[PDB]
Paper text:
In addition to recruiting Pol I/Rrn3 to the ribosomal DNA (rDNA) promoter, Core Factor has also been implicated in transcription bubble opening.
We thereby subsequently obtained reconstructions of the Pol I Initial Transcribing Complex in three distinct functional states, with overall resolutions of 4.2 Å, 4.3 Å and 3.9 Å for states we respectively designate State 1, 2, and 3. State 1 shows a striking feature that the upstream DNA and Core Factor are rotated more toward the back of Pol I, projecting the DNA away from the active site. We also discovered a continuous movement of the Pol I clamp, which gradually closes up to 4 Å from State 1 to State 3. Transcription initiation by Pol I is a dynamic process, and the three functional states of Pol I Initial Transcribing Complex likely represent snapshots of ordered events during transcription initiation: State 1 precedes State 2, which is then followed by State 3. Thus, State 1 with a slightly open cleft should correspond to the step right after the loading of the promoter DNA, whereas State 3 adopts a more closed cleft resembling the elongation mode. State 1 likely represents a step immediately after promoter DNA insertion. Interestingly, when the upstream DNA is extended into the cleft, no obvious clash between Pol I and DNA is observed. Therefore, we speculate that this DNA path and position of Core Factor could represent that of a closed complex.
Numbering used by the authors:
A (entry chain F): 72 to 154
B (entry chain B): 803 to 974
C (entry chain B): 1090 to 1143, 1146 to 1196
D (entry chain D): 12 to 49, 80 to 100
E (entry chain A): 1029 to 1109, 1112 to 1200, 1214 to 1273
F (entry chain A): 1617 to 1663
G (entry chain G): 8 to 170, 214 to 251
H (entry chain A): 1 to 141, 172 to 268, 312 to 444, 450 to 686
Write the structure that this text describes.
RNA sequence: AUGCGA
C-alpha cells in the first residue's frame, strides 16, 4: 500500500474537506491537552486555536489519501498547499 | 385557553372492596406545603396559581398508607378555574372519587403567534414594536398592526384595500 | 455525530471468536472473583470440556445459573447503535448471523 | 479501572519466551529498577528490590 | 455511493468506476460561473492576480507539460479542426495529465473559448493595461485548476438533488411522468415513442410531405365509408 | 423487499464489505464519503 | 467427525514451556523473556512522551501484576517498539506517525516488547521463609515477593505441631526459615494471586 | 458518544450465514419449555418466556448474566422445536431443490458432467474470471464413463490453469473477486443453472422417475403418483403427502452425493470455512428465544399490553406441548395394541397437529403466511414500508435538537441564528476543561444552570456526572474552585473534567427546514442568543434557500456535540459555502421584497 | 351499540348499506369556533373511497 | 391512525 513519496501523484492542495477535518481533529486534540506550539494569544475556543495552528502549519498531522485500491499517500500539513 | 381535566379513580373499580383512595391525607408525612395549593380535602383552591409539578389533588390509599398526589404536567403555569364533583351515573360512590378540574391558561399576544385579516393573508407577529418607535401620523396616532405592501402583489388581496378604506370611512 | 454519536451510541459486547454481539455475557463474579466478559459460543461445558479426552486453570467462568464454562474469555466491546443489537434480536429468529470482523486475530 | 485508556486491547508474543538466566534476570532487574528510580508501582519496585535482595541471597 | 475518487475519477462508494472524470473536467459548478467570463475577469484582472498569485505555487507543479501537449495537440488539432476515425494522435490533455497538477490540462472546449476570446480582444490586448494572453491566459488556467472539484465530493447525491428538487416546479409525455418513465422505470415501452428524421437539404418540402403521407400506416377501416349487411 | 434481498444474501453466504454509505450508517461506521473519504494520522516525536 | 476439533482444543490449549528447577535445586525458571506485540491507546497528553506515554498508561501499571495472557505477573519490560504507521521510513524518525481513530483525539498504536514474566507451573520446587504457622497452613514468601502457603492437608501428617502455634517437622524438630515444596496450585482468581503449595509431593 | 470512552476494535465487515441448532443449543442461554408467562398474578414463570435467563427483572438479575435491567444487556434463550419447520424464506428454495433431485437414485436429473461444468463455472465466478468462465465453454469432445471422466479431467485441468493464472496475476485473491458485473454474471449463471435443474422431467443420471411435487402453499408438500405409461415406463426403468423430516433425510443424502459441485453452488465466493452444506438449513429443529427485554409488553406509564411475540410464541409452546402429548399418545400407544385403529384419529392428530404447529411457526415467522389484522411478525418488522431500518435506522430521533416557529431579523448576521434564551439555557456543550478555558467554564458554573453562558452539569474525568440543576450557587462556587483539581486515579490520570456549558455566541448550530429536498436546506449557522425571544430568529437572505416563509414555518435546530462536526459546521455547512446552488450556480441568497424596493428608491439618481 | 358506532364510525352491517367506507361516519363537533361549529353542519363529503383514488377528476 | 402547520 505504501505510495513512494517520490511517487506520490495526488493534488498538492488541501481540499475543503481535508482542511475541515484537519482543523477539527487537531482542535479536539488541543482540547485534550495536545501541546500548543503557538501563542494562545487570548483564544479560548480550541477550534480557533487549531485555526491558528493551520495558519502556521505547526500541526504534526498527516492525511492518508486512499485510492479505491487501498493504496494511499500520506501527506503532511506542512506541504499540501493550504490555499 | 381553557384545558379541562378528568380525574377518575373508578377505572380500577371492581367490587368496592379495596377501594381506598380519598382525597385528603393520612400519614402526615406529606409535605405540609401541599396545603399551599390544596385544601385539606385534596382539591386546589379555585383561583390557585399552579405550575407544572405542583400537586393537582391529594388523596390517600390505605394500601400505601400514604397521602399521594397527582402532579400537574404542563409547559406553563395555570390557575385553577373550576373544580367539579362528579358522583353522577354512580350507584353510590359517595366518596367522590371522580373530579373534573378546569384550568385557565392565559394566552398573551406574542412573537410567532399567527394573526390574519379577513382575507386569508395570515402572518405571525415578528416583534412587539415599542409605541415610540412606531411611525406616528399627523393625526397623532400610531397603528396597531403594520402589514408590508409587497405581500399584496402576489396575493391580489385588494379586498383588503377596500376593507381598509371602508372601515376607515365607517369609523369616521 | 447526529444520527449516531448523539443519539443511541452504545458500546456493546461482541465475541472476538464468534463475531456476534448477542453471545456475549458477563461472567459471574465472586467475593474474590470479578465478572468477566465471555462469549457463549466461545466456551466449553464444564460437564464435558473434553473431560473424556482431557486445564489451564483460570478459563472457567460462571453463569448467573451458576454454571461453569471454560473459554468464552475472548470477547471485546465495540461501538455501534443499539438498534443494531436489536437486529440480532430478530435475526436469531431469522436464522442468520453477523461475522463482525475486527482487529488482530 | 476497566478500560482501554489504561489497558491494551490485545497483546501477543512474536516468539516463544526465552528462559532468562538468573544472571540475565538479575541484569534486567538491576537495569530496569535503576532506570525506574530516575505512582504506587514504586512500592512494587521496592518489592522487586526485595526480589533483587532475594535474588541477591538474603532478604 | 457515488462520489469523487482521489484520482478525479468518479467511482461509487464500492469503487466501481462510473466516470473517468466529472463531466470530463472535474470542475465545480459553484466555481464555473466566471470560469467562462473572460472579459469580466480581465476588467478586474489585477484583483484576481492579487488573490491567486502563482509565485507561491509555481514551485509545486509543472507549467509546461500540459502547455506543451497543448502546443503539439493544439497545432495538430487545428490541422484536424470528420469526427470519425479522426486524428487520434492526441487524446485531450485531461487524458494525459492530472488537470490538478500541471496547469494547462484543460478541456479543449475551454481552451478554445479562451484563445478565441484572446484573439477577439487583441484590440483589448491593444487596450489592456499591460497583460498578455500568456500571463492572462496563465492566470485563467490557474483559475481553472483552482476551480476543480475537490476529491471526495458527494457528487452522486448532488446530482440527485439537482434533478429532484427542481422537478417540483414541474403530443409526447412531458414532466414528471416522462422523467419517471426514463429514470425511475427505464420502461422499454414508452408511452409516446418517437423517432426524429432529418430530411436532406435537397428534399423538397412538398416531396417531404409526400413522403410523410407515403409512410404512414393506413388501416382498412380508415377507408371505409358505409357498411350494409343484409 | 429487504427480506428478499436478505434471502439472496444468506443463500449466497454473502459478505458485506461495508462500503455502502447506507450500510455503513447501519453499522455505526464513519461514512466513507467526503471527510470520511480519508484518514488522519499524527507525527509524534520519537525522542 | 468430532476429533479434529478436539485436536483444536489440545493444540490450542498446549503450553509452551516447563520452567525447570534451576540446577534442579533452585526454583523453576518460571521467569522468562518473551517478545510480544501489544495494542495500546495513546492519549494526546503523551504526545511528547509517547514511549513513556505507553509506559505510564499501559506498561507501568502492568509490572508486578498478573497477566492472564502471559500466565503470570509481569516482572518487567525490555525493548519497546512502536510499529510505524508508514512504510519506507528506514525505521527511524526523530518523530513517528500513528493512526488516529476516526472519532476522537485518541491514538491507537502497536508496540513490540519482550516481557520478563514469572511463569510458574505445577510441580515447581520452591523455597520460602516461613511467614506464619496456623493449624491449617504455613505462610512463606518467595523472593520477598510471592505469597506461598502450604495448608495442613497438603502437609504430611508426620509433621508435628508445637503450640497460631508452631509446627514441628516430620523428623521431630520444629520447622524454621525456608521450606522446599512442590507447587500444587496457584490461585489468581482473587484480587492478586496465591500459590498453593504442598509438602507431601 | 464520549471522547472519554474510545474503542479500537471497529467492525470491518459483516458476514451473513445460517445459524445452526447445535450452535443454538450450545450458545443458548436457556431452553424455554413452559407456555406459562406469569404466576401468582405477578411472577416470572420458571423456565418460561419471562425466565430471568432472558434478562433481569424485578430486581432479579438476568439469570443468564446476573445483571440488572439497567446493567444486564440481556440474553437470548431457545426452544427445542419438537418438529422441524420449513423455512418460509427458503420455502421457494427448498421446493425448487426438492423437484430438482432424482428420487430413486437421489442424484440430480442433469448430466453429471454437465454438473461438473457448473462447478467449474461457479469456481471461476468466485474469482470472477468471467472471460475464462466462458472460455470453459470451449472444452469440447453415447459418451463413455472414461470420456465423461475425461471431460471432468479436462475441466478440472481448466480450473487448475485458471487458478494458476489468477494467482500468478494477483488478479484475484483467496477471498474471491466481487464486482457489480461479477455479481450479475453470477445471478445470470444461477438462473440458467436453475433452468437446467427444472428441465429434467425424469432422471437422466439415474433415469429414475421423480414424483411430481405439489405443495399446500406454506405447510405441506405432496408426492404425486405417476402414469401407468410413466409407471410402466418405470417398469422399463425397473398427491401423497411427505413429511419435512423425510425431505430432510433424503436431501441431506443428495447434499452428500452432490456436495462436490455444491461447495461452490452454495457460495458466491470461496468457502474458506469448508462448510458442509446441510439440509437442516431450510428446516428449524429449534427456535431461539429473544430477550424479553426487547419482547417487553407495551407498558406506557402504567398500561401493560401483552407482546405479540409472547402470544404467538405461546402458541408455539401450546401446540408443541400438544404434539409432545401426541408423543405421549404414541407412548400410551405402541406397546403393541395390534388392532386398535383408535390411533387412526390420533393419526389425524399427528398429521393435522403437525401441519398445524408447523404452520403456526410459519405464521410466527410471517403474518402473511398464516390463516383479520393479526399481530405482526418479524418480517412485517423493520422492512416493508417505514419500519425500523427506514424509520429508526436510516432516520432517527436525536438529542440536542429543537423545533420552533422561525422569525425574521435583519439585525443579526445573515449567517447566524437568533436563539431565544430558553434554548440558550437548555442546550449544552460537553466542554473539556483546560488551563485556557478554566476561566470561562468556572464562570459558567458560577452562573449555574439557570443563567446565561452557563452550564447545567459537570462530568468528572472519573466518568461520574454531577448535575448543577439543583445545586446552590455556593456549592457550584465550590466546584468552581474545584474545576481545576489534579488527577486522582492512575485509572483516570489521562482525563480532564468536563463542563456542560450552555450554547453560547461562539457555537455553530445546524439549522434545517422541512423540505429536505436538497442539501442547501440544511446549513450551519453561527449561534447568537437573543435576549427576550421565544422564537427562532432568522435573516431574510436565507429564506429562499430553505424555501421558508414566516407564514408559520417551523425549523429544526441541531447542536452538534463533537469538534469534528463543529469544524464541519464552521467550514462545510456554513451559509457562505452555499453561496450558489450546485444545480446551476445561480448563487441563491439575496435580499427580498422590501430590501429590493428600498434599493430601487435609494438608488434613484434623485436621492440626495 | 349505537354509542359505539356513533363514537367510532365503525359501520358494520350484514349488507354494509351499500356504502363505500366503513369508517369516518362520526365526527368531533370541535366547538372551538362559532365559524367552525356552524360550518360542520354545512360540510358534505364525496366519501373517503374517492379520497383514496390517485386521480383528481 | 385523524387531523393539523403546510
Ligand atoms: Zn464466539
Ligand atoms: Zn442478561
Ligand atoms: Zn437421479
Amino acid at each position: 500500500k505504501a505510495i513512494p513519496k517520490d511517487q506520490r501523484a495526488t493534488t498538492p492542495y488541501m481540499t475543503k474537506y481535508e482542511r475541515a477535518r484537519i482543523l477539527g481533529t487537531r482542535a479536539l486534540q488541543i482540547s485534550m491537552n495536545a501541546p500548543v506550539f503557538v501563542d494562545l494569544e487570548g483564544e479560548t475556543d480550541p477550534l480557533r486555536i487549531a485555526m491558528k495552528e493551520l495558519a502556521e502549519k505547526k500541526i504534526p498531522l498527516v492525511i492518508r489519501r486512499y485510492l479505491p485500491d487501498g493504496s494511499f499517500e500520506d501527506w503532511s500539513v506542512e506541504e499540501l498547499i493550504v490555499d | 385557553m381553557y384545558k379541562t381535566e378528568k380525574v377518575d379513580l373508578a377505572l380500577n373499580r371492581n367490587r368496592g372492596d379495596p377501594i381506598t383512595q380519598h382525597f385528603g391525607f393520612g400519614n402526615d408525612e406529606w409535605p405540609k406545603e401541599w396545603l399551599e395549593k390544596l385544601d385539606e380535602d385534596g382539591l386546589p383552591y379555585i383561583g390557585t396559581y399552579v405550575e407544572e409539578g405542583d400537586p393537582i389533588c391529594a388523596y390517600f390509599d390505605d394500601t400505601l398508607n400514604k397521602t399521594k398526589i397527582k402532579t400537574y404536567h404542563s409547559s406553563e403555569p395555570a390557575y385553577i378555574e373550576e373544580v367539579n364533583l362528579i358522583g353522577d351515573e354512580s350507584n353510590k360512590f359517595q366518596e367522590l372519587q371522580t373530579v373534573s378540574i378546569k384550568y385557565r391558561i392565559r394566552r398573551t399576544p406574542q412573537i410567532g403567534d399567527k394573526f390574519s385579516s379577513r382575507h386569508g393573508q395570515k402572518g405571525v407577529c415578528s416583534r412587539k414594536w415599542p409605541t415610540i418607535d412606531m411611525p406616528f401620523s399627523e393625526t397623532g396616532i400610531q397603528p396597531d398592526i403594520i402589514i408590508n405592501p409587497h405581500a399584496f402583489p402576489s396575493r391580489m388581496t385588494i379586498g383588503m384595500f377596500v376593507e381598509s378604506l371602508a372601515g376607515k370611512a365607517g369609523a369616521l | 455525530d447526529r444520527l449516531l454519536n448523539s443519539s443511541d451510541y452504545t458500546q456493546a459486547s461482541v465475541c472476538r471468536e464468534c463475531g456476534s454481539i448477542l453471545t456475549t455475557q458477563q461472567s459471574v463474579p465472586r467475593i474474590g472473583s470479578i465478572s468477566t466478559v465471555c462469549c457463549r459460543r466461545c466456551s466449553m461445558r464444564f460437564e464435558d470440556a473434553k473431560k473424556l479426552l482431557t486445564e489451564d486453570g483460570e478459563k472457567i467462568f460462571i453463569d448467573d445459573s451458576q454454571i461453569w464454562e471454560d473459554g468464552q474469555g475472548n470477547k471485546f466491546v465495540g461501538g455501534n447503535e443499539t438498534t443494531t443489537v436489536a437486529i440480532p434480536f430478530v435475526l436469531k429468529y431469522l436464522d442468520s448471523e453477523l461475522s463482525a470482523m475486527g482487529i488482530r486475530l | 479501572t476497566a478500560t482501554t485508556l489504561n489497558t491494551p486491547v490485545v497483546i501477543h508474543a512474536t516468539q516463544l519466551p526465552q528462559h532468562v538466566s538468573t544472571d540475565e534476570v538479575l541484569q534486567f532487574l538491576e537495569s530496569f529498577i535503576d532506570e525506574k528510580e530516575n505512582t504506587n508501582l514504586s512500592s512494587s519496585i521496592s518489592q522487586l528490590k526485595r526480589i533483587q535482595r532475594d535474588f541477591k541471597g538474603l532478604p | 455511493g457515488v462520489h469523487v475518487s482521489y484520482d478525479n475519477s468518479i467511482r461509487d462508494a464500492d469503487g466501481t468506476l462510473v466516470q473517468f472524470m466529472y463531466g470530463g473536467d472535474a470542475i465545480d459548478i459553484t466555481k464555473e460561473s466566471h470560469m467562462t467570463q473572460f472579459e469580466f475577469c480581465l476588467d478586474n484582472y489585477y484583483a484576481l492576480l492579487k488573490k491567486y498569485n502563482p509565485s507561491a505555487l509555481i514551485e509545486h507543479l509543472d507549467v509546461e507539460s500540459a502547455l506543451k501537449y497543448s502546443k503539439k495537440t493544439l497545432k495538430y488539432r487545428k490541422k484536424h479542426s470528420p469526427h470519425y476515425k479522426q486524428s487520434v494522435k492526441y487524446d485531450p490533455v485531461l487524458a494525459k495529465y492530472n488537470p490538478a497538477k500541471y496547469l494547462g490540462s484543460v478541456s479543449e472546449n475551454f481552451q478554445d473559448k479562451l484563445e478565441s476570446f484572446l484573439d477577439k480582444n487583441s484590440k483589448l490586448f491593444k487596450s489592456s493595461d499591460g497583460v498578455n494572453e500568456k500571463k492572462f491566459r496563465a492566470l485563467m488556467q490557474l483559475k481553472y485548476m483552482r476551480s476543480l472539484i475537490n476529491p471526495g465530493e458527494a457528487v452522486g447525491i448532488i446530482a440527485s438533488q439537482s434533478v429532484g428538487e427542481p422537478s417540483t416546479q414541474m403530443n409526447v409525455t412531458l414532466g414528471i411522468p416522462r422523467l419517471r418513465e426514463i429514470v425511475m422505470t427505464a420502461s422499454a415501452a414508452i408511452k409516446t415513442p418517437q423517432m426524429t428524421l432529418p430530411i436532406w437539404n435537397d428534399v423538397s418540402d412538398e416531396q417531404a410531405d409526400t413522403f410523410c403521407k407515403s409512410i404512414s400506416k393506413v388501416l382498412l377501416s380508415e377507408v371505409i365509408d358505409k357498411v350494409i349487411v343484409t | 423487499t429487504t427480506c428478499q434481498f436478505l434471502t439472496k444474501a444468506v443463500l449466497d453466504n454473502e459478505r458485506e464489505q461495508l462500503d455502502s454509505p447506507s450500510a455503513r450508517i447501519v453499522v455505526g461506521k464513519l461514512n466513507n464519503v467526503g471527510t470520511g473519504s480519508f484518514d488522519v494520522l499524527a507525527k509524534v516525536p520519537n525522542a | 467427525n468430532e476429533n479434529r476439533e478436539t485436536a483444536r482444543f489440545i493444540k490450542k490449549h498446549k503450553k509452551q514451556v516447563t520452567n525447570p528447577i534451576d540446577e534442579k535445586n533452585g526454583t523453576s525458571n518460571c521467569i522468562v523473556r518473551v517478545p510480544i506485540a501489544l495494542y495500546v491507546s495513546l492519549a494526546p497528553m503523551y504526545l511528547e512522551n509517547p514511549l513513556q506515554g505507553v509506559m505510564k498508561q499501559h506498561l507501568n501499571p502492568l509490572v508486578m501484576k498478573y497477566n492472564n495472557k502471559v500466565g503470570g505477573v509481569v516482572l518487567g519490560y525490555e525493548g519497546l517498539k512502536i510499529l510505524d504507521a508508514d512504510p519506507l521510513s528506514k525505521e527511524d524518525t526523530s518523530e513517528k506517525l500513528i493512526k488516529i481513530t476516526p472519532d476522537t483525539p485518541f491514538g491507537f498504536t502497536w508496540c513490540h516488547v519482550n516481557l520478563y514474566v514469572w511463569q510458574p507451573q505445577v510441580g515447581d520446587v520452591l523455597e520460602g521463609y516461613i511467614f506464619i504457622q496456623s493449624a491449617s497452613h504455613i505462610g512463606l514468601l518467595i523472593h520477598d515477593a510471592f505469597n506461598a502457603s502450604i495448608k495442613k492437608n497438603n502437609i504430611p501428617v508426620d509433621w508435628t505441631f508445637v503450640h497460631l502455634g508452631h509446627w514441628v517437622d516430620s523428623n521431630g524438630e520444629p520447622i524454621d526459615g525456608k521450606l522446599r515444596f512442590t507447587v500444587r496450585n496457584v490461585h489468581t482468581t482473587g484480587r492478586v494471586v496465591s500459590v498453593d503449595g504442598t509438602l507431601i509431593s | 458518544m464520549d471522547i472519554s470512552k474510545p474503542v479500537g476494535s471497529e467492525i470491518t465487515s459483516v458476514d451473513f450465514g445460517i445459524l445452526t441448532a447445535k450452535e443454538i443449543r450450545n450458545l443458548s442461554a436457556k431452553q424455554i419449555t413452559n407456555p406459562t408467562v406469569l404466576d401468582n398474578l405477578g411472577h416470572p414463570v420458571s423456565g418460561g418466556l419471562y425466565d430471568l435467563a432472558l434478562g433481569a427483572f424485578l430486581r432479579n438479575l438476568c439469570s443468564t448474566c446476573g445483571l440488572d435491567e439497567k446493567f444486564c444487556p440481556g440474553h437470548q434463550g431457545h426452544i427445542e422445536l419438537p418438529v422441524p419447520c420449513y423455512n418460509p424464506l427458503f420455502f421457494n428454495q427448498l421446493y425448487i431443490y426438492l423437484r430438482a433431485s432424482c428420487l430413486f437414485c437421489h442424484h440430480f436429473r442433469l448430466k453429471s458432467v454437465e454438473v461438473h461444468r457448473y462447478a467449474c463455472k461457479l469456481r471461476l465466478l468466485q474469482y470472477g474470471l468471467i472471460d475464462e468462465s466462458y472460455k470453459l465453454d470451449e472444452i469440447t469432445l453415447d459418451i463413455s464413463s472414461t470420456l465423461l471422466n475425461e471431460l471432468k479431467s479436462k475441466r478440472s485441468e481448466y480450473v487448475d490453469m485458471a487458478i494458476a493464472k489468477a494467482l500468478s496475476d494477483g488478479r484475484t485473491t483467496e477471498r474471491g473477486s466481487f464486482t457489480a458485473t461479477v455479481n450479475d454474471e453470477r445471478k445470470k449463471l444461477v438462473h440458467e443453472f436453475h433452468k437446467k435443474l427444472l428441465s429434467r422431467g425424469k432422471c437422466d443420471n439415474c433415469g429414475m422417475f421423480s414424483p411430481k411435487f405439489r405443495k399446500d402453499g406454506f405447510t405441506k408438500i405432496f408426492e404425486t403418483a405417476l402414469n401407468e405409461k410413466q409407471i410402466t415406463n418405470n417398469r422399463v426403468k425397473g398427491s401423497t403427502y411427505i413429511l419435512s423430516t423425510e425431505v430432510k433425510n433424503i436431501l441431506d443424502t443428495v447434499f452428500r452425493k452432490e456436495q462436490c459441485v455444491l461447495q461452490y453452488v452454495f457460495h458466491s465466493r470461496p468457502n474458506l470455512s469448508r462448510k458442509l452444506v446441510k439440509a437442516d438449513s431450510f428446516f428449524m429443529d429449534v427456535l431461539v428465544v429473544p430477550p424479553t427485554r426487547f419482547r417487553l409488553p407495551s407498558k406506557l406509564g402504567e398500561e401493560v399490553h401483552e407482546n405479540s411475540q409472547n402470544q404467538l410464541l405461546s402458541k408455539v409452546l401450546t401446540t408443541s406441548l400438544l404434539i409432545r402429548d401426541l408423543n405421549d399418545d404414541l407412548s400410551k400407544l405402541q406397546k403393541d395394541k395390534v388392532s386398535l385403529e383408535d390411533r387412526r384419529v390420533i393419526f389425524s392428530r399427528l398429521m393435522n397437529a403437525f401441519v398445524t404447529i408447523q404452520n403456526d411457526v410459519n405464521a410466527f415467522i410471517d403474518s402473511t403466511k398464516a390463516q383479520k389484522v393479526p399481530i405482526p411478525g418479524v418480517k412485517q418488522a423493520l422492512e416493508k414500508k417505514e419500519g425500523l431500518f427506514r424509520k429508526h435506522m436510516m432516520g432517527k430521533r436525536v438529542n440536542y435538537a429543537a423545533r420552533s416557529v422561525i422569525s425574521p431579523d435583519p439585525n443579526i448576521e445573515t449567517n447566524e441564528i437568533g436563539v431565544p434564551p430558553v434554548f440558550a439555557v437548555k442546550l449544552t456543550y460537553p466542554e473539556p476543561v483546560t488551563a485556557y478555558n478554566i476561566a470561562e467554564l468556572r464562570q459558567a458554573v458560577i452562573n449555574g444552570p439557570d443563567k446565561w453562558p452557563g452550564a447545567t452539569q459537570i462530568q468528572n474525568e472519573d466518568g461520574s456526572l454531577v448535575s448543577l440543576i439543583g445545586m446552590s450557587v455556593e456549592q457550584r462556587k465550590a466546584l468552581a474552585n474545584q474545576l481545576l483539581t489534579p488527577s486522582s486515579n492512575v485509572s483516570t490520570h489521562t482525563l480532564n473534567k468536563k463542563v456542560y456549558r450552555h450554547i453560547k455566541n461562539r457555537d455553530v448550530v445546524l439549522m434545517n427546514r422541512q423540505p429536505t429536498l436538497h442539501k442547501a436546506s440544511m446549513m450551519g449557522h453561527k449561534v447568537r442568543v437573543l435576549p427576550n425571544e421565544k422564537t427562532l430568529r432568522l435573516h431574510y437572505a436565507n429564506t429562499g434557500a430553505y424555501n421558508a416563509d414566516f407564514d408559520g414555518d417551523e425549523m429544526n435546530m441541531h447542536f452538534p456535540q463533537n469538534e469534528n462536526a463543529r469544524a464541519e459546521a464552521l467550514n462545510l455547512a456554513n451559509t457562505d459555502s452555499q453561496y450558489l446552488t450546485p444545480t446551476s450556480g445561480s448563487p441563491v441568497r439575496g435580499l427580498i421584497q422590501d430590501h429590493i424596493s428600498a434599493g430601487v428608491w435609494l438608488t434613484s439618481k434623485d436621492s440626495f | 351499540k349505537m354509542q359505539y358506532f356513533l363514537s367510532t364510525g365503525n359501520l358494520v352491517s350484514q349488507s354494509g348499506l351499500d356504502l363505500q367506507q366503513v369508517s369516518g361516519y362520526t365526527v368531533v363537533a370541535e366547538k372551538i369556533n362559532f365559524y367552525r361549529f356552524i360550518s360542520h353542519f354545512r360540510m358534505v363529503h364525496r366519501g373517503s373511497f374517492f379520497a383514496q383514488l390517485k386521480t383528481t377528476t
